[PDB]
Amino acid sequence: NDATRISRSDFPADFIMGTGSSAYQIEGGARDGGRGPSIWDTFTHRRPDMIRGGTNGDVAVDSYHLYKEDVNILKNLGLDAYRFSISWSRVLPGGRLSGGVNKEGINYYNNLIDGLLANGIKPFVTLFHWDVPQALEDEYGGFLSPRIVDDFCEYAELCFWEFGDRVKHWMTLNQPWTFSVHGYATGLYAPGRGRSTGNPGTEPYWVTHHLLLAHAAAVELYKNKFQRGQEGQIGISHATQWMEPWDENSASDVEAAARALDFMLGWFMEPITSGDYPKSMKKFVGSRLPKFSPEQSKMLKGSYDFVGLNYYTASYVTNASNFSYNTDIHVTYETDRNGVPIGPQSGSDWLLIYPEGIRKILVYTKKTYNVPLIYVTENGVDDVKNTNLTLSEARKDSMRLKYLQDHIFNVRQAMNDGVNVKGYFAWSLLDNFEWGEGYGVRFGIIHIDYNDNFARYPKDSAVWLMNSFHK
Amino acid sequence: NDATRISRSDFPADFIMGTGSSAYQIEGGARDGGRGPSIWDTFTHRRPDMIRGGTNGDVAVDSYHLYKEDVNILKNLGLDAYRFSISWSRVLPGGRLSGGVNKEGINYYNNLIDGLLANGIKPFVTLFHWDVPQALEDEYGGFLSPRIVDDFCEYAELCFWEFGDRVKHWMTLNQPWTFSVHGYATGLYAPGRGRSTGNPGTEPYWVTHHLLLAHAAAVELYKNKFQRGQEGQIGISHATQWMEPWDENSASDVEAAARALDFMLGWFMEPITSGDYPKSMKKFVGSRLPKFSPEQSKMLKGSYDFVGLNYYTASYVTNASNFSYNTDIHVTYETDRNGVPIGPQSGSDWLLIYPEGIRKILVYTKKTYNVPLIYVTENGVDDVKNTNLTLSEARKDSMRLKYLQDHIFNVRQAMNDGVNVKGYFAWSLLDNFEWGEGYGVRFGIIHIDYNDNFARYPKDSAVWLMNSFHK
Amino acid sequence: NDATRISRSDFPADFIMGTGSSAYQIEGGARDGGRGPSIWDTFTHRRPDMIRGGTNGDVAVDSYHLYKEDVNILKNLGLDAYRFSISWSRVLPGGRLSGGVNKEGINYYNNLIDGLLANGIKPFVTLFHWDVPQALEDEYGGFLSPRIVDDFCEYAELCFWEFGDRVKHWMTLNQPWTFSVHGYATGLYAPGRGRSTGNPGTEPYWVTHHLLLAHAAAVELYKNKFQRGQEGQIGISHATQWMEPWDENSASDVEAAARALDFMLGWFMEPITSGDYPKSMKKFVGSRLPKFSPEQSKMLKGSYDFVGLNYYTASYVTNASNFSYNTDIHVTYETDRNGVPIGPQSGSDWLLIYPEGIRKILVYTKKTYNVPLIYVTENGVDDVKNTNLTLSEARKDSMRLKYLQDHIFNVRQAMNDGVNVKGYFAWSLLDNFEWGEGYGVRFGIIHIDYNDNFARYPKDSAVWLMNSFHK
Numbered sequence A, B, C: 001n002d003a004t005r006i007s008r009s010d011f012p013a014d015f016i017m018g019t020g021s022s023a024y025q026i027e028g029g030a031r032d033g034g035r036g037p038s039i040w041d042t043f044t045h046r047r048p049d050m051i052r053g054g055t056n057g058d059v060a061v062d063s064y065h066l067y068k069e070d071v072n073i074l075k076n077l078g079l080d081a082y083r084f085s086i087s088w089s090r091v092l093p094g095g096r097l098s099g100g101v102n103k104e105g106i107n108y109y110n111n112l113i114d115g116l117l118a119n120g121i122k123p124f125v126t127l128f129h130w131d132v133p134q135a136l137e138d139e140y141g142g143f144l145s146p147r148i149v150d151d152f153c154e155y156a157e158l159c160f161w162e163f164g165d166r167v168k169h170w171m172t173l174n175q176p177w178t179f180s181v182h183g184y185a186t187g188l189y190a191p192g193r194g195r196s197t198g199n200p201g202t203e204p205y206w207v208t209h210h211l212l213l214a215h216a217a218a219v220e221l222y223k224n225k226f227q228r229g230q231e232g233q234i235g236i237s238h239a240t241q242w243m244e245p246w247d248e249n250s251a252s253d254v255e256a257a258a259r260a261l262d263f264m265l266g267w268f269m270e271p272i273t274s275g276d277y278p279k280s281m282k283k284f285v286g287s288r289l290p291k292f293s294p295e296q297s298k299m300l301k302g303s304y305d306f307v308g309l310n311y312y313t314a315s316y317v318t319n320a321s322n323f324s325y326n327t328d329i330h331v332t333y334e335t336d337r338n339g340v341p342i343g344p345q346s347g348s349d350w351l352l353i354y355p356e357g358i359r360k361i362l363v364y365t366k367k368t369y370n371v372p373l374i375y376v377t378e379n380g381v382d383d384v385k386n387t388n389l390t391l392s393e394a395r396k397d398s399m400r401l402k403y404l405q406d407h408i409f410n411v412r413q414a415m416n417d418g419v420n421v422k423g424y425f426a427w428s429l430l431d432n433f434e435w436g437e438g439y440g441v442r443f444g445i446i447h448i449d450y451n452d453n454f455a456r457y458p459k460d461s462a463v464w465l466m467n468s469f470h471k
C-alpha cells in the first residue's frame, strides 16, 4: 500500500521482470559485419539537420562489439528477461532474400541469445523497430507498397528458423503508431515524408494498413509452420498514452478522449480484435481509410498470443473547432486544469509524470478489447539534461527511481482490478540513441559515458531493481 | 615480317606490355569487406533470366581473396603492367560520401597496389567499369541524372588521394559505349532499361552525355589538384570495332561505314576533341541529342593525357532503308562479301577474326582525331566452348595464340604508319564472369577451374607472352 | 605576385613544410598503456562545467590506437615534417622517476617515430604542451614550485636518451604563455587557479619564471650531454599575436602596442636573449616580478638553437585608465578602427583574419631580439560551426584554404625582408580536442567524423598543400 516498499513478493511467482532496447538505438556497427543500410541510416546521414547535434547511430553505444559486457550487466542485474529487436538489414542486407543472407549477422544474434540463456535470462525478441532496409524503401516505397508483406514474411521466417529453437517469445512490431505518424504525418522520423513529396492525409493510413497486414501474415506463418515444433508465442507492441477528459463532466470531452484513444490504440487494437477499424475512425476519415478484404479481416482477427503496451505519459483532451491525420482526430490536448499540470515534467517536456495512467490504460485495454494476456513492454523516464555532473552525481536518478516505483505499484493495482499482466519491462537498459533527440536524452537504468568508450555504470534505479526484484 | 616471330625486340625500349581485368568480373567478395551493391549485383540477382545459367558475380573467380596468387601469376608472366578497375561501391558502399567511407575496401586496393609494385608491375587503374553503386541508381537514376557528376568527382578524388602516390596512370571510364547502349538502348546489360520503363530513343543520349561530363570534371579535378603533386597521367578507354564498306566502291557505303564509326567512337571521341558531337549524329538524331554549355565544351575539349582503345572484331556496313539509337544510325551490318565472311569465328559468333582492323582503327583514330598518345587497352579472343576437355587439352589455346600474334603484329605496322602507340594490353588475365554470358565463355590467358576453387593455370598463350615479351 | 599562386617553388629548397598536434588533443588512451593522469585529465573530470559540452580527452580522436592511419595520412599528404608532443605522464606516470618508467608508453613513441621515418617524414618533438603529471601537481604544486626544474630535466633526459638517435629537432615548451596566463591568471585552463585558491597577481609570474628555468636547464643538459653524440637541435615555441596601435599617430598608442608585445612575447624572449625580463615589465610589475640570480641569467642567455612562433590573429592597442597580470599590462584591446574591423571573423570571434600580422611579428622578432633562425610552428584557422553539413559540404574549407595561402605568402615576404625563416607548420593536422571549447571547434586540415570512430577525411586545404608543396 506504499509504493516505495513494492517488491518481487508482491507479485505472483511466474511474474516476469526485465528491461529492453532496440537495434538501431544501441548496436552501432552500422556498416560492420555485412549489415545493409536502413532508412534510419539514410535519414540521419542525408538530413543531419533533423537530429539534435547532427548525430546518427553508426556507433551508438556499440553493443554490437560490447554485447558480452551488456550480458554481464544483465546477469548482475538479476531480472528474468531482456527484450531487444533484430536489425532486419543486418540479417538481410538487401531486405529481400535475393539480396543475400548475412551469416555474420545471424551469428551475432545467436551469440547474444546463447549468452543470455547461458545466464538464465529469457530473451523477448521484436522483429521490427522502424529500421526498414533502405533497399526495399528505394525499390518500392517500403511500407507504402503492399509488396512489403511478402518480404516481411520471408524475414520473419528466417528468424524463426534460426532462433526459434531458443527464442520462445516473439513480437512482430513495436510501436507501429510512432512509425506511421512521425514517418508519414509529421515527417519528423524516417523516412521523413509529408510536409510526390508525401501526404499526411493519406500515407499514414496506408502505412498503418500495411503494418497490420505484415503483422498478421507473420503471425499466421508462425502459427501454422513453427508453433507446433517450437512451442513459443507471438504478439505485438503498441504505443499508448492515457487520454483524460479536460472537463470530467462535459460528456463531449468524454467523447474526445475516447476518440483520441481510438486514433492511437484502436487504430491497431480494433483490427486484431474484430478485424476492422473503429467507427470513430471510419466516420471522421471516411473514404481515405482503406478496407480489409474479408479474408484479410479473418486473418487479422485474433492474430496474437499476447499484447504488450508501452506507457509513458498522459494528456487532457477536449474537442476541437488540407487533410491530415492530426486534424482528422478532432481533438486538442491540454496539460493543465486551471493552471495545474496533469503531473510534473521529467527531463523532457512532453513527458508528464502520471502513474495512474498506466493503471487506467491497462484496465481500459482489457475492458475495451478483451485481451487475455498482457505485458507492459516499455515504461520509463529520462534524466534532466546536465553535462555538468560528475559520475557519482549523474548516477543518482531519484526521479527515475520514484517513477518506476510508482508505475510498478499501479501495474500491481490493475492486476487486482482483474487485468491479467504477466510481466513488466523497464525502458531502457542503456542510455542510448534517442532518434530526433540524438544522444542528449538519457532513458537508461545504466549510465553511458560518451567521453570514454561508452563505459557502462549502474544508476541507483538499477541497483534498486536488482535488490527489489532479483530472481 | 612474319607474325609468329614477333617479339619484344621489334618494339621501342619503353613500349609497355600488360594484361587486364575489371572488378566485377573477377573480385567476388560481393558482400565481403563492407562492399555495397552495384547495379550489376541487382541485375543478376533480380533478373537471373537475363544471364546464361542464371549466375552472378558474388564469388566470380574470387580475386578478392586470391589476389596474392594473381600477383604471383603476374610476376611469373613477366609483363610490365597490369590494368584493373576499382569497385566504386567497395570504397563508397553508399556511392556518395555521406554513405560512409569503407576503410577495408581502401585497404584491399592498397594491398593489391603494393603487391604489384613490390614485383615491378606498373598498375593502370580504371575508375569505372559499369558497376554503378545501387544506392545512387535508386536515389536519382544514376547516370540518367546529372547529379552523378558531383558524386563521381568525390569518388575520383578519394582514389587519387589514397592511391595517387603510387598509381601514375589513370583512366576515368572504360567502354562507356557499351554501358550506354546495352544499358539503355537494348536493355540487355544493367540497369536493363528501354524495352516509365525506359526509352531507347532518348536515355542512351543522356547517359552518354552524363558519362562524358563525369569524365571531364574528373580530369579537370586531377589536372588542377593532383597532377603537380603526384605527376601521373589520366585518360579514358573506348569501345571500337572496325567498320568496312560492304562494297568498296559504293561511296554510299563509304558513308555508312564512316557514320557507323561516328555513332560508336565519334560519339565519345569528338566531344573530347573539339567539344561537340559529330555532324552525322547531330543530323540524324537532331533535337534528341543534348548540347554542351560552352563552358562544358571548353572543359571537355582536350580532356585527356592519352586514349586507350579496345579492339576485337570488324564488320561490313551498308546503308539502310518509334525512335531508337539503333535505328538512328541508318546502317546495316553484313558479315560476308559474296558468301565470304570478313574473317573466321572464334568461340563467339559476334567475333570475327580480322587482324587488319586494329591497324585501321588505330590509323583512323590518329588521322580523324589527332590523338598524340595511344594504348591498346583491350584485345583478345575466347576459347571454343567445350566442357569435355581435360586440362592439358583445354590449355592449348592455338587460336588465341595466333590471334594475339596477328594483332600485335598489326599494332607494330600502325606504328610504322606513324601512329604513336605506347603500349598494348591483352584481354583478359583470367577466365572470368562475362556479363550476360555468365561463365560459359573463356577470354583468359590464364585458365580457371570452376570445379576446384578457381584454380589458376597458364594457357600456351600465357607462356608465349612470357617468352616473347618478358621484361 | 599572387598568394593563390604560392607554391613550393617560391622557397629555398631546404625550406620545410609540415603540420602538428599535441598529445592531449589527439591521443586518447588516457588510461591505456600505463599512462598516468595530467592536470588536464583532472580538470576536465572534476570541473566538466569548464568545458563546452562537459567533454574531455579520454578518447579524443584516438591517435593512441589509430596512429598508423595518421602516419598514412601524413605520407599521402607529402609534406616534410610533423610536429607532435610527448605526454610526460605517459612515459613517467608519476612525473618523477621514482614513480616508475613506463616501457609501453616509450614503445608507443618509438613506433610513432619509426613509422614517420620509414615514410620520409621528419619528426619535430615538443616535450611539454601543458599536460603536467597530476602526481607532481599534487606533491608540490607543479610549476608553482622550483622543484619542477629537476623533474623536468629527468623527463627531458629520458626522451633524449630514448629517442635522440632518430629525433634531431626538439622543443622544450610550446606556448608557455597560454599555460601561465589561463592556468593562473584567468583560471580558465588547468589547473584553473586565480579566478589558498590562487593569486592572479603573483602566480603567473612564478609559473613563468619556473617555465623559463626548466627550459634553460633542459637546453643546458641537451647541449652538454647529448648534442655532440646525437647532433640535433633544440629550441622553444612562443605564442604571438600582432599588436597594432589603435591610432597610428598617438605615440602613446605606439607604446601601448610595444608594451603589449612585451607582456606577451618579451616576457619569454628577453630572458633568453639578454637573460632578464623586459624593462616595461619591471616597471609596471615592480617587486612582484621575480629576479634571476646572475648564474641563472648566464644559463638563460642564448639558450636555444632556434625559436618557433605561433601566429593566429592581431589586435589594436591603446592605453588604459587588487593586482592582476591582466591589469598590469595597462592597455586596452580594440578590434574596430571606426567600425572598420582589423580583419574578418573566422568561426571564432576571438580570431580575426589579418595575414600581414604574421609578416610584422616575424620582422619584429628578428629586429627586437635578433634570432638567427626561426620556424613558424603554428598557424591556422577554424571552420564555421555547423552540424548540418554532410561530408561533401563540410570538407570544402575555402576560408582555411585562403587563410593558408595569404599567411604563407606573407611568410615569403618576411624572408625577402631579411628574416631567416626555415619552415612553416600548419595547425593542425586533425580536428581534435580544443581545451575549453571541447570538440565544437574544428582546426584540422583533415576532417574527423565524431559519429563514426573518428574517421579521417582530407579537407580541400589538405589536398591543396599536397599539390602545391609536395616533397
Ligand SMILES: C/C=C1/[C@@H](O[C@@H]2O[C@H](CO)[C@@H](O)[C@H](O)[C@H]2O)N2[C@H]3C[C@@]45c6ccccc6N[C@@H]4[C@@H]2C[C@@H]1[C@@H]3[C@H]5OC(C)=O
Residues within 6 Å of the ligand: A022, A175, A178, A182, A188, A239, A240, A241, A310, A312, A350, A378, A428, A434, A435, A436, A437, A443
Ligand atoms: C508513446 C511513447 C513515445 C516515445 O516513444 C519512445 O521514446 C523513447 C525515448 O525517446 C525511445 O527510447 C523509444 O524508442 C520509444 O519507444 N516518444 C515520445 C516523444 C515523441 C515525440 C515528440 C515529438 C516528435 C516526435 C516524437 N516521437 C516521440 C516518441 C513517440 C511517443 C512520444 C512522442 O510524443 C509526441 C510529442 O508525439
Ligand SMILES: C/C=C1/[C@@H](O[C@@H]2O[C@H](CO)[C@@H](O)[C@H](O)[C@H]2O)N2[C@H]3C[C@@]45c6ccccc6N[C@@H]4[C@@H]2C[C@@H]1[C@@H]3[C@H]5OC(C)=O
Residues within 6 Å of the ligand: B022, B175, B178, B182, B188, B239, B240, B241, B310, B312, B350, B378, B428, B434, B435, B436, B437, B443
Ligand atoms: C567492342 C567490344 C565488345 C565486348 O566488350 C568486352 O567483352 C568482353 C568479353 O565478354 C568482356 O570481357 C569485357 O568486359 C568487354 O570489354 N562485348 C562484345 C559482345 C557484345 C554483345 C553482344 C550482344 C549483346 C551485348 C553485348 N555486349 C558485348 C560487349 C560489347 C562489345 C561486343 C558486343 O557486340 C555486340 C553484338 O554488340
Ligand SMILES: C/C=C1/[C@@H](O[C@@H]2O[C@H](CO)[C@@H](O)[C@H](O)[C@H]2O)N2[C@H]3C[C@@]45c6ccccc6N[C@@H]4[C@@H]2C[C@@H]1[C@@H]3[C@H]5OC(C)=O
Residues within 6 Å of the ligand: C022, C175, C178, C182, C188, C239, C240, C241, C310, C312, C350, C378, C428, C434, C436, C437, C443
Ligand atoms: C595565441 C594563440 C591562442 C590560441 O591557442 C591555440 O588555440 C588552438 C585552437 O583552440 C589550439 O588548438 C592550440 O593548442 C593553441 O595553441 N587560443 C586563442 C583563444 C584563446 C582563449 C580565449 C579565452 C580563454 C582561453 C583562451 N586560450 C585560447 C588559446 C590561446 C590564444 C588565444 C586565446 O585568446 C585569448 C582571449 O587569450
Ligand SMILES: [Cl-]
Residues within 6 Å of the ligand: A096, A097, A098, A099
Ligand atoms: Cl527475392
Ligand SMILES: [Cl-]
Residues within 6 Å of the ligand: B096, B097, B098, B099, C390, C391, C392, C393
Ligand atoms: Cl554527400
Ligand SMILES: [Cl-]
Residues within 6 Å of the ligand: C096, C097, C098, C099
Ligand atoms: Cl626521484
